[PDB]
Structure of Cellulosomal scaffoldin adaptor protein B:
Amino acid sequence: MAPTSSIEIVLDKTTASVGEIVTASINIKNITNFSGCQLNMKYDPAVLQPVTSSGVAYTKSTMPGAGTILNSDFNLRQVADNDLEKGILNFSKAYVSLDDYRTAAAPEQTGTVAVVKFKVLKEETSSISFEDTTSVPNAIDGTVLFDWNGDRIQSGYSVIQPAVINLDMTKASYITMGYDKNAAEVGEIIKATVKINKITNFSGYQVNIKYDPTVLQAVNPKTGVAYTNSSLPTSGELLVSEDYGPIVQGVHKISEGILNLSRSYTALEVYRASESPEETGTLAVVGFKVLQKKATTVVFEDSETMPNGITGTTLFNWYGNRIQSGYFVIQPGEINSA
């Protein structure tokens, strides 16, 4: 299930100086009967410039470079309509000879669908993400994947993003997850810790986390006892001062591999009066028991229950204001990579 089935933007380097090239590979994994896609990619056009006839700036009609799938003889349709002023790449890449593709019975479910090279114009931490555009509609975070019947794939995959270039792990403002280990055998528990860095006047969080319940089981990270749909996470370093009235709740859908966790201080005036904000530290620990040893991941993922969420995350300051910008969501790595 998702996020084992995914589309992701993967950079070949995570730091690059001005004038250097960063290669963004658009990779899919385990997309059943995949035949094609339409993707709307957003970047900051003050920071990055898409390039290549190896070296030449894209124009309006420039297609991304070829990847490792969608190169076969099933009548590939390709169109691009890029807005270089706004920093939007929009392209379609799909097989049209679907009857023949089906009959071939060898679907291209995993690989690189396209490559976009970016030249760095400015020293500035910056992200690349697929984003909804009104000229879609019903994309999933700017992504439309098609199966070999020509039907849109409407569920069952995660959009793993943003891809971030030139992030300073000490200085940047972000939320992320870390693992105590990124490989583990069947029956072992991986401890996944939600944590933040430099979030100004932070007072609480809500996060929506997606895992593949056929590969990992949500459990208490010490005891191994399975989470139910109301299980609390184990507390971390932050939001544990009793004086500020923390409240915590979990509302999950374990059969679908969805956790939703929230913890906030409530006595915000008392907290503000301390003049000692909690801005960097761990928020929550969840356990993941390995059911099968195969490559998977855990991700922050948007929820229809969090329409104002930023890739499945909401952070509040100590006036109860949603922090709407100025931090990155940093997805954790792969678990049990091959």
Residues 172-338 form a domain with the Immunoglobulin-like fold (CATH 2.60.40.680). The longest strand covers residues 111-120.
